[PDB]
Amino acid sequence: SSGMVTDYSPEWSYPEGGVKVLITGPWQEASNNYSCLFDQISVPASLIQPGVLRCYCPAHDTGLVTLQVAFNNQIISNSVVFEYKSG
Amino acid sequence: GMVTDYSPEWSYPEGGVKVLITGPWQEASNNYSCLFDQISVPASLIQPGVLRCYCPAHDTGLVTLQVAFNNQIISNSVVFEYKSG
Numbered sequence A: 001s002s003g004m005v006t007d008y009s010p011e012w013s014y015p016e017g018g019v020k021v022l023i024t025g026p027w028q029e030a031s032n033n034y035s036c037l038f039d040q041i042s043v044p045a046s047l048i049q050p051g052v053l054r055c056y057c058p059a060h061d062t063g064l065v066t067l068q069v070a071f072n073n074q075i076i077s078n079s080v081v082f083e084y085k086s087g
Numbered sequence B: 001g002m003v004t005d006y007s008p009e010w011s012y013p014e015g016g017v018k019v020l021i022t023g024p025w026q027e028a029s030n031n032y033s034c035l036f037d038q039i040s041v042p043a044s045l046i047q048p049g050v051l052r053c054y055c056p057a058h059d060t061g062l063v064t065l066q067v068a069f070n071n072q073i074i075s076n077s078v079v080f081e082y083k084s085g
Helices: none
Strands: A007-009 A020-024 A034-038 A041-044 A046-049 A052-056 A063-071 A080-084 B005-007 B018-022 B032-036 B039-042 B044-047 B050-054 B061-069 B078-082
Touching: A007 B018, A007 B050, A020 A063, A020 B005, A020 B018, A034 A052, A041 A052, B018 B061, B032 B050, B039 B050
Parallel strands: none
Antiparallel strands: A007 A020, A020 A052, A034 A041, A034 A063, A046 A052, A063 A080, B005 B018, B018 B050, B032 B039, B032 B061, B044 B050, B061 B078
16 A cells, blocks of 8 residues: 555645545555645545545645655655645 | 545636546546536546546536546536635
8 A cells, every 4th residue: 555646636725724635546455544644744534445545634834745645654655745825 | 336536626717627536437448538517528547446637617606527438427416616716
């Protein structure tokens, strides 16, 4: 299940967060221990189906941040840019 | 089959927003498309079960979003919204 993020949507959120984000990649594990880290802030993630993780982004100041996928809190993907826009 | 999820669920009237739609999409052939209130736009299979498309422009309001293959609808309809902006 370790590898690289193939896509994610949306690529941004307003500062208050609370936006669903889908992240695709080689995630296959059955165990419910996936999480997503936005600028190191962790939120739980759910495996919708093989290769598809869903999470609701956390609140964060405007700016660009790293978005990573972890399993048992261990980073298992590359970092991709996620943007918090002032809006 | 059925759409398992999709994101984002909305767009501004001008459209031009990337939308990922997940489900039982396995086909190898490059003939997937997405229908927004009957407006068709091409879609690409990023990887099994994952389709990417860029939504069309549309007047404010709720519309149906469906997945098709070879121009024939193969999924249920899910709500997609164009917000005033």
